[PDB]
Symmetry: C4
Subunit: 439 residues, 4 copies
Amino acid sequence: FVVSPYDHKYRIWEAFLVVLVVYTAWVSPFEFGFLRKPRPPLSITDNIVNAFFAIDIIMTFFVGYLDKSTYLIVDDRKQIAFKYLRSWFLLDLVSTIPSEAAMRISSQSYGLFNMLRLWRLRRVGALFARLEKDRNFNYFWVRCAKLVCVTLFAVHCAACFYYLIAARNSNPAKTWIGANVANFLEESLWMRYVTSMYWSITTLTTVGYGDLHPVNTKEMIFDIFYMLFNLGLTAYLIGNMTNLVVHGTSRTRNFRDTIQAASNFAHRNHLPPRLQDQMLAHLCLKYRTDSEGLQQQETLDALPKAIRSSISHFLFYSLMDKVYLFRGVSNDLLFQLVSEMKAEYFPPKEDVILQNEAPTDFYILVNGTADLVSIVREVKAGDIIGEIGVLCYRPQLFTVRTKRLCQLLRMNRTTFLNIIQANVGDGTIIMNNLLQHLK
Amino acid sequence: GGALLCGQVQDEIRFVVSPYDHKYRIWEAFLVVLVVYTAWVSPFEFGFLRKPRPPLSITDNIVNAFFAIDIIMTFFVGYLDKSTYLIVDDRKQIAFKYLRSWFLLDLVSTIPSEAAMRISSQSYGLFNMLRLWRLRRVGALFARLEKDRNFNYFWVRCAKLVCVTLFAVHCAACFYYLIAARNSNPAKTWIGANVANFLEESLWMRYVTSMYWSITTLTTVGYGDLHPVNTKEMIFDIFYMLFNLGLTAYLIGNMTNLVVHGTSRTRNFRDTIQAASNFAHRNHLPPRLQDQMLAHLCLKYRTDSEGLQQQETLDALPKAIRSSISHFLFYSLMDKVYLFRGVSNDLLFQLVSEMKAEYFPPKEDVILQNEAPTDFYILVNGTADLVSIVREVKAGDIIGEIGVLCYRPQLFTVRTKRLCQLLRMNRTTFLNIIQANVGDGTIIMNNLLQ
Amino acid sequence: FVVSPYDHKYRIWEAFLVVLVVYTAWVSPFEFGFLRKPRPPLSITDNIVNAFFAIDIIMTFFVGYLDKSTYLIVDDRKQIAFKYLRSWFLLDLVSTIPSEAAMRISSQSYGLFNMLRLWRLRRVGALFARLEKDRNFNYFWVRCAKLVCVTLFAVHCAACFYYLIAARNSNPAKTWIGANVANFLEESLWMRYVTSMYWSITTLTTVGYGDLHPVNTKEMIFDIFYMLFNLGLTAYLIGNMTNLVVHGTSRTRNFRDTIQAASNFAHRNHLPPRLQDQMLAHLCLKYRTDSEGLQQQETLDALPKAIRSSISHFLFYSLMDKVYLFRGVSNDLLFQLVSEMKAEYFPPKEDVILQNEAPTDFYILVNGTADLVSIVREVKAGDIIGEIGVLCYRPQLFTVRTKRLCQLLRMNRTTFLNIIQANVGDGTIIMNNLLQHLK
Amino acid sequence: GGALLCGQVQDEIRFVVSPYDHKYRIWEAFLVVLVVYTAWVSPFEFGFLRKPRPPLSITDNIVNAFFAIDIIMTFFVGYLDKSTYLIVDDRKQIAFKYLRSWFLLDLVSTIPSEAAMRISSQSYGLFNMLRLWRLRRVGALFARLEKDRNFNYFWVRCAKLVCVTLFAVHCAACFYYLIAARNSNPAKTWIGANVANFLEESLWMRYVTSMYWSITTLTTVGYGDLHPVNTKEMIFDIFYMLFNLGLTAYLIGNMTNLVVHGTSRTRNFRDTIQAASNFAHRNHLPPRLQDQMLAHLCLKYRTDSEGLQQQETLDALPKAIRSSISHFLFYSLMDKVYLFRGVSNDLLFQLVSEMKAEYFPPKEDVILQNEAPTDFYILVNGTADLVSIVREVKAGDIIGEIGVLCYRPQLFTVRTKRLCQLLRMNRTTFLNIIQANVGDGTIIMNNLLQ
Ligand SMILES: CCCCCCCCCCCCCCCCCCCC(=O)O[C@H](COC(=O)CCCCCCCCCCCCCC)COP(=O)(O)OCCN
Ligand SMILES: CCCCCCCCCCCCCCCCCCCC(=O)O[C@H](COC(=O)CCCCCCCCCCCCCC)COP(=O)(O)OCCN
Ligand SMILES: [K+]
Ligand SMILES: [K+]
Ligand SMILES: [K+]
Ligand SMILES: [K+]
Ligand SMILES: [K+]
């Protein structure tokens, strides 16, 4: 029986009903403003759309709900039906009665009863509430789409109401439209619609050419309220667009402040130009490494250590399988290794470590390649550097120079000593499998 | 999973009367309605009318009577002085402060216009304009509401903006009509150039036409059907247009302030979640792993949000009540199970000040069987099972400590079945805690040992 | 000889010349747009103003300048004259030649030569630069005054240029003004001015009634550029007004976030309602204590310890003179006392400490009064509480209850013990002068 | 004093060519000028002209020739791949990437219109509109300038806004004229309703009239002299007015962003200074004392600003060059006087890593005679005297250490005579530093002892 929310076969039905809501949002004000009585084709199409919402009146029984008081999805048919009968079953139901039936109770009913069908706009508000949570869509741009919809619906409604004020008048002259057009009745419905839409947008944007304007007090009262609504709407629009701009441009501002800080530091302390250019080159690479190294380390430093470890195991243990200088070591020691290892990125043609430097650290190349340097040999992907210096505790035997954008795992001798004070018997495998690379 | 949990986290992200008396605040709230009345009627009497007439005269005298009652009653209402923060109830001091401030303006704002018009017949409208002194009461009300936690700041500010713009529209409409009505020739006026005999038309039509012009100008729609015809009208409209420029910039500044204010914390959350999303996408992590890390990241954000609020609300606060608060917290957050019964106050403080609160997702496992006893927990709220199941775990219940204080690998796995809050303690810090006054630690061991 | 900048007698002269700049800013575009040849009174008044600026051409010799490369004011007559002759002496000089003399070189010179006098606006920009630094004036509101000036000057200039475009035309009809007015020449100069000012503001505010608008291509080109300038100006105005609003309202937002944080903390941990009301009462008092306790402690915690000490000596040593329980102690020990003392504020009817509490701290009342409590005695201004408990190290003998908004200095026993391990022989005066209050 | 110091602080607050070759960047910068030409001419040929004519045809063929040269030359220009950050110089890879991306669009954007018009005579204006593909080069230029430290971000953004709004105005003017010129009756058009025979008027007059309408509409001034007369013009203007609403909101959003961005750090300074100002005012501090504390507060703000920049620029940076930077700093910030000559590397590091930099006002005293030797300093820059005077103190000079390493009350007062920067060391931390490898500390004592 009870269908889950978040069922994909249900999500496509709700998305379909939203396009029938967009149809309703256009048709209902137009039928209110421009039409007197039901006519083909619009009558049969509206009855078709009412059939789809009448199906939904039933199919919203048998659908569960997330009770956020307990964070579980309720599947009890007695509870879901009781909740729906309380939650606006009657408004949905009345919004689906045919206009023919709803006007046998009174012939004047047509336009104003069809305006009740704007109740369906609750579904558009619900869709925006979903998209403002779903991380697959940008939040500020979904707010933009929401504000575009509100604007277009306002322009359409105002056009239909203001035409109705003219069309109901006892004289076609002395109306805003009949003041310009000799007889706007007995003129094409498209031309009357476009003329009203033109007036409406001309007013909402405050261009106000003044070819079309209020001629009588009823028109003036309507336009007074429409102009006051437009002042609030535009101030809201400019607020939201400012927020969209301010947060969208933030990356470039932060990058420039970072480079400005480094440049000022170099100019205060009078760093040598070579090393200054290396500092800026690494900061630029960090900004261009957003999708990898940046959002990697900006995530991993937050995670609880259990899942953090499981990530490191997924991501790098297959690299630890490549290094002969750990072959057959105890599994826990190699897990500890990847749990301690930092990860870093280097530009091309940079020294990671120089010859005759003290062995404070060692590295494993994840990807990219480097030269020991004059040149003696090449370092592959899945290959290790500096470790014999960390073992020996004597100065490093060669400079290692990047020749690609290169990713390296890193460890420090002070913690490697501590790691070797763990697993002390497995340290014999460390020793032997170094000695057999040393042979 | 995951999505609905982070959605929830985003959703969470002798005769003196006191001025605080409810009966007095109902009276003050009533008088603000008569201020809104005054704000409409005084410009209208200045613009459109030349002598007092029914119903407006009798209604104004009724309103003046309510304000005259207030002129009396405010001699019997105390005030608080910023030197002492006590309410002053000395009749002489209440009288002196009222006389020295606002009594005279309140008095002239209350004299009947039918009396003032015996001083001169030209006085009527311009004397009515003095009643706008009463607007101080609306400014006072908004100042209270803006700093009151019961009221939504967004809607209080919006109400302020709406009142300012409506009052500006109304005043400009009345002044611009007065410039037309007081002219020597009606046909050379902004209104008589359109309506050939406007002085014969209904007062409603003239008002609506003036409001229409005023709003058309302030919104800058400016259809141009109605516009300045003569030099007086041009000078007036020059200053009105300048004012409207400043007012529009103020309205947009306030709406921008409101939307960046209200969005800020949701933005701060989104950045962390979308960073983790981009990481998981780019490194091609399995979906089965991804939603576990997104769930934990959302619940860490929830945890430290509450921690910062506790810190910033305690470390601001004088040592006396900071003591009382931290005392109550220590003596009420702990003691959640009989294993602690008889714990000494020092051992209590050392434990409860070091335990770390955290939130844990539904349908997940907090500790695992036969693992080393690195940590133990107290369940604050939510529900879990010891696990096949052996029993349910309640709120006000514990896991893992039976392996920690006497060293054993953990006897059970434990699995959540609602969103759950726990207090963690790690064995290394627990050992340091138990090393304080060790005898009491032995009494806890006796509570466990059976 | 050389007069200093920041001499008050010079600052009043520069402020006077700024009002003559405001005169120039109105008169020069008006003479350019509306007048053909020099006429009384405006000719004699302009010659008077030129005399004041000609005095300044001389009096700007003999005035020093702050050389911000070395942060000293230069007094060398050879340097100040050399700097001035380089720095725009010639533009100031040409801006003071009389219009009569400057039009004997050519009769058409009058209007366009008088436009050169807008060079004097450099002085208004300099005044705003000063006021944007002087802490006696609000920064955002000085930016507002700057933007009002720019707006009013733009409206005036545009009105004068657009009238000149009409007045130079070969036909009065086919001009924006002669299209409405049958003959605008031979009409009052005030009416022509007001008509132009009206058109100008109607356009800059974008109301655009359209009674007055460009009739010919020269007018259209001018209005094209004016409308493009106004779009930038209004967007700048709205930016600056937003910044003014955002920073001006910040106090209320921070207060509400503080109270919301405390309210949520109480609702999470389920604090008892009495103590919850005390917590909010103290946070409210802190916000209302902005000018004293807040900006006091928000300043003192920053200051370098030497000046911080000198402040404490100025502010509270005269209170330390009142306490008999330190009479005749070594001066250094009492300075150490005031250097250690914190300062705090309490609402009326609050316990600072209760009876039978442990003696962790003691206090001295700066102002306000309190009861020992049932009641036994009253505590004055310049009076001490809790110290016998800190001496005895046994629970406090009475509750002390505020009966005003009260300010107290505070110390903690752990640091008072350390302070008594300093000055150990002067501790004998502490002991004896307690024992003689204990008698 | 004081005021000018805080004012200063506020003022401070085989055949491949590389794409980085200066000769190539001059060529690319030249082609952007021909893009601005194309952006004007293509809408104008679409709106106002029906067949190619001098001078415009010959000028367009000259511009097409420069782009055809670029279509060739871009086969000889390398690119950098984001996988390796090396420049690719393989001729086959350069060719393939260019063919696989933009060669075809660059080619059709270069065919002479006098050739395309042999395919059909109606093609002319609509084929010219395809040349607007070239605008990608302007978008690329702005993307470079926005992230380039040599260029002011404010003016680069303003230039972007000005170009977008000018191009929108121009395009709308040309399209709206085309709607009029292509109508069956000129008198029923937005322009022919005003100018009875506009097709006889000069091309300049028609262009200026169309630009005037376009700007009047986009700025929303809307005089209404020129407006839509027929249904086609109304539909066009409906969509133009909607677009202008979005564009205006974007312009105001960018200007707000720019002014809050540029003001932020001055705001952050002002708050600290005005807090201290309000404190000194309310507590009635003497002016003689006040300006001393305001001076020190301004120079502390200056000091810690530079400290945060050093931290955030070092702790971001890989350990190799972080080492090189900190190494150079340690070996160059110290050794400022002969008292340190022969200092050991460990004692050097322990000292220089712990010394604290600070700024000190003019005409003030850093240490006083016969006071206890609590601290000593190295002068980094500025000037002072030992004090009556006994001698000047240089940059690269020291004060007070002669009382610290051998314990004595300080021999002199010392007084600044310019704004001065010093490195402090406190005797307690100095003792801890000297307790590392004490023999080297004795060699420093031998350097002082004579
Ligand atoms: C920098 C850009 C510069 C742009 C260019 C300018 C060019 C020169 C021209 C300058 C023109 C400037 C004109 C003024 C601009 C608008 C100023 C609005 C000020 C304002 O609203 O103040 C608030 C009024 O609050 C209140 O409490 C008011 C209460 C009013 C109650 C009225 C009740 C009316 C009822 C009847 C209505 C009429 C009948 C309708 C049918 C005060 O508070 P605050 O905002 O400062 O907040 C507290 C701080 N955060
Ligand atoms: C939320 C509020 C919603 C309001 C209500 C809306 C109601 C519905 C209607 C919606 C209408 C929306 C219409 C679009 C709005 C404006 C969009 C502007 C977008 C834009 O400018 O993008 C920039 C163009 O940059 C460029 O690089 C462009 C370069 C162009 C060069 C042109 C050269 C022209 C030379 C010739 C001129 C003509 C002759 C003049 C005599 C891209 O960059 P970015 O800003 O994103 O920056 C990078 C991120 N930070
Ligand atoms: K307008
Ligand atoms: K108009
Ligand atoms: K018009
Ligand atoms: K407008
Ligand atoms: K208009």
